[PDB]
Amino acid sequence: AKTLLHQYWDIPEGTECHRKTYAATSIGGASGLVVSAYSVALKTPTSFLEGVARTGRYTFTAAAIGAIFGLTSCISAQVREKPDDPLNYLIGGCAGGLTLGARTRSYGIGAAACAYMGLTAALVKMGQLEGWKVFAEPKV
Amino acid sequence: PGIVELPSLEDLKVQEVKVSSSVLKAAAHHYGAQCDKPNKEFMLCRWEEKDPRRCLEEGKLVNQCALEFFRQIKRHCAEPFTEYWTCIDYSGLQLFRRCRKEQAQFDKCVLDKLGWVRPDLGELSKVTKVKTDRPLPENPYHSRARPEPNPEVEGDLKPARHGSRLFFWTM
Amino acid sequence: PFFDVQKKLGVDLDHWMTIQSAEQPHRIPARCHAFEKEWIECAHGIGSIRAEKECKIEFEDFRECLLRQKTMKRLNAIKRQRDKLIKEGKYTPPPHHSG
């Protein structure tokens, strides 16, 4: 939601670390709860303990993606000392994609997720950095 | 916001007409006959300016007119006006058709010693003029002025500048 | 589209159910009549955005006539302060039926 993505982008980036990883776990847990809610509403896994298993699995994988994304963002920002270039979030998205492939236990899915999550994380970084009004002016 | 102003009880005490609803309903038409010439100043005040705490002086005047009317009906004819309202009292909802004998008695009484012709049906109607003393008000809704008119686009119109001015399709 | 055969034929089929301050069957008012009359006469020939930025005061006045939010807030605070001081033990109050 808006309040916790504002919690994520409130931190100077920069380093005010593990606040970043806590907010990224919050993002991943919320997204996994969304996906688990739809996937238990449209599948009905028969039975309820397996539904708890599927929800815990999806939320744990999405929270792990968020946590490792935030950790390697923090580490790349501390090492390179450059809060400007999106290559740190490129490394971040690739680390998140490789841990996604580690959880789903398929290496090609992990490589493709590395590539696309790195590109999208760099695009979100550049959208926040340069300033790209997504969805709306809504004026002319 | 701006707090309200209310008159205190140094002014809001007229001796009330402390008769009940039965006799006050029974004595209606003659109350409209002799009195209720100066009540329309009060009612015009109330309908022009929608503000009580303004027309209370004329409320005092109509209250003393009603009290003087009932004092006059107590002094003159008669005593069986008491009989008339205690005859219209116990008849449930007050029909004017049950106790009509004593209405004729009361009308003969009031024509003998006071006059006071009964108003015809439906002569307590027929929208009425009255002269006043206070002026007619502007902006009785205590609101601000009107913000802006809209600049009206008028005049004739020319053919358009180079047609569409889209990507192409010039004229 | 918002077609206006409604206005072209000259038939008042939908302009009487619509708003307050119209002609009621017996000529009677509403509860918040003059508030809407002033608000509509504020925002009549105005393009619905500077009507927001200019006719806002009378609109909030009409809303607080309609729901009576802040007046019930004030009454609620009066009763709660009444409760806390009568629990404290000051002036078992004779404002009702007396002074």
Place this chain on the structure above:
Amino acid sequence: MNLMITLLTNFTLATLLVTIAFWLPQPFSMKFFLVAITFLLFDLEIALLLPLPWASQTTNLNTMLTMALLLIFLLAVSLAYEWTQKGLEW
């Protein structure tokens, strides 16, 4: 709430009577279906009609005459429609 007092007293009287009476022994047809829906629709039009006597005095009596006759005439049109189209039979 005075009729609530009456209703509560009679409910308690009836309930005590029934509890004494019980604690002291000492397929489907479509022709059945259409009657209920036809009831439902004509009763809805009754609910449209029946505020007519509250309406019986107004300034425009001819508009009320016209629309009231249009209401009952449409009710008769629907009744005669299902009469002619052999619907409510057995």
Place this chain on the structure above:
Amino acid sequence: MSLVYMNIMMAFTVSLTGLLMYRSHLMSSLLCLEGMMLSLFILATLMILNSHFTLASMMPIILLVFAACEAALGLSLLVMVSNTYGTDYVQNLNLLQC
């Protein structure tokens, strides 16, 4: 804020969830829709009564007559569904798949 409005909107959300989640029946679902209709009726009628908004008192009676004939259409469709089957379950509608 007229406190009864709070519990009636609460009752609306209750009847809405009763409409949306429903098991092995359609008559109960349509009956919860009828309850939601009653909720809208009562809520609009308390508004029109407290606001003295007299000329548009047609909203409750017209709302309820129109949604009543909606309920009549729904009952006819339920009878057709139970006619082409034995019962009227949410089950056995599994054909005509997505």
Place this chain on the structure above:
Amino acid sequence: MTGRQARAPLQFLPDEARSLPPPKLTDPRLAYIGFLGYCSGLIDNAIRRRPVLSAGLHRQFLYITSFVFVGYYLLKRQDYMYAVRDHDMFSYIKSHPEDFPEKDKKTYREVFEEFHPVR
């Protein structure tokens, strides 16, 4: 974009559209509409198995007439809409001198740019 003097009936063309010049006959757009009508008639003879380029000449002439008539009225509506758009635009230009200033046309004797040579 909406009214723009919302007296505004349904009003396919006002009387004010008789002040702008009407579209000429054999303007290229109505000639294109006539060609589209002739292709419509050809393909209508092709839908049913009647022979093409024959046996439907009254339908050919009806299609050409109907499309040219309707396109004529739509072109008059197009001209009206663009004329009222330009009239409103120039009225707003004239009605507000503040927001639309005169820009200082500095000639290229004193306008500096970067160069960035491609070697």
Place this chain on the structure above:
Amino acid sequence: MNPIILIIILMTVMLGTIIVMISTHWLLIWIGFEMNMLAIIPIMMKKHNPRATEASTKYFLTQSTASMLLMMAIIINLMFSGQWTVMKLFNPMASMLMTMALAMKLGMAPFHFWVPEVTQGIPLSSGLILLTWQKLAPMSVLYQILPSINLDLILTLSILSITIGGWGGLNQTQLRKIMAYSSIAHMGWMTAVLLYNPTMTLLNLIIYIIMTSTMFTLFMANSTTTTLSLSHTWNKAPIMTILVLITLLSMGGLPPLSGFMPKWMIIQEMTKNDSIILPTLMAITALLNLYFYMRLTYSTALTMFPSTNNMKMKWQFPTTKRMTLLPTMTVLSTMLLPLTPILSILE
């Protein structure tokens, strides 16, 4: 199913849409949607198979709960600033409930689970009338209440509608589910523009209705439900082949053909704001929803599937239907590229 009764029911569908368009009062908007429902139920079940019965059941439940949600939003509107005018609302919660009601009414991607099912088990005339009129009439209401909508509602539902109506659609060999997923994609394309310039939305509505009428007329000329029947209609007559070719390629939105005027003008008056990532995402998904059109065309008129005989017997009997209006709608739907300044026909 007497012709008088069909004329009456179609006239009531027309009357419901006119009452939706014409009124300045919310009760007639609700009555128009409701009468449109009550009349559009017996255009379905023109046959008597249980397919049409279950389809009308699903459509009735979703349509009716959308109508009740609409009435909830209107009663919240009168709980706030009290008048029954069709204008700017006075609650983000009321506009939220109302846009979700109209989203269930005409189909968005969390809501579209009734659309392919109800188009599967009905004939083609009922699908034609429900697609055209049920996606025409609430666009007027959104056009009237556009200045008071939270943007994330419309735009999230529109993005999601385009991508789900694209992705669902690469896996159906039925015709009606392909056309239903295409309807969902075009509802998304009309809805995403609505807060920016609604002339584009109404013009896209006109173009999509003409395209859908051409599509369903070319399926009414020869009774087909699967693509194998489309290949047999290659074999029986050659002009149906090239017109399925041209109308499928105009559903795809290719520039010399007249299905590109809706997309590209939307791109123009979308990107005269500062929204660029949203147009390129929407138009890459518009690249995506062309593939099932293209495999449809490869089935019909570009390759040639081997056909069963008795076409030898069908050749003696010409296609003697009447078309509603096939050639005029075809040439108006496909040859209308250079009349893009008929955009300004609309204000």
Place this chain on the structure above:
Amino acid sequence: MMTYIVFILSIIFVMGFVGFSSKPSPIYGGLGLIVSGGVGCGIVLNFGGSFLGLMVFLIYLGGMMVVFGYTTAMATEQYPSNKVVLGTFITGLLMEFLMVYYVLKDKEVEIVFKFNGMGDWVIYDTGDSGFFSEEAMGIAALYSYGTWLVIVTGWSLLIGVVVIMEITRGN
């Protein structure tokens, strides 16, 4: 036995809606909706509410639940309660009691609203002199003002009749 009678009837109204929204057997659902309709009629009559609230009781509990229980009984019975229904009824009762407690011992309750927590004897009218029963004259429109309205309403009712007979095998 106190002032909060509209609040108490609203609480038993929400009790009834939960009592049939927990998905019971449909005839028990019809019983719960009968109880809910009776107490909702009590609510709208306590706002007064003379005409329309009892008017609709003839329709809603006079012309609807009969057909509901009718087509309930003649279609299917499924003679067997279940723990999921009892659990949902307990959760509904707990939501009711929690909302009542946070209205009682607080000021305001937010879903996204500000409900002032006290039984609304206020706000209410200050006893205006009607003599014509406002809502009855309200419903005494539709006939001198309701030109288009009753035409489209009766039109939709006629179409409802022909739709019912067509679906149940026209002709």
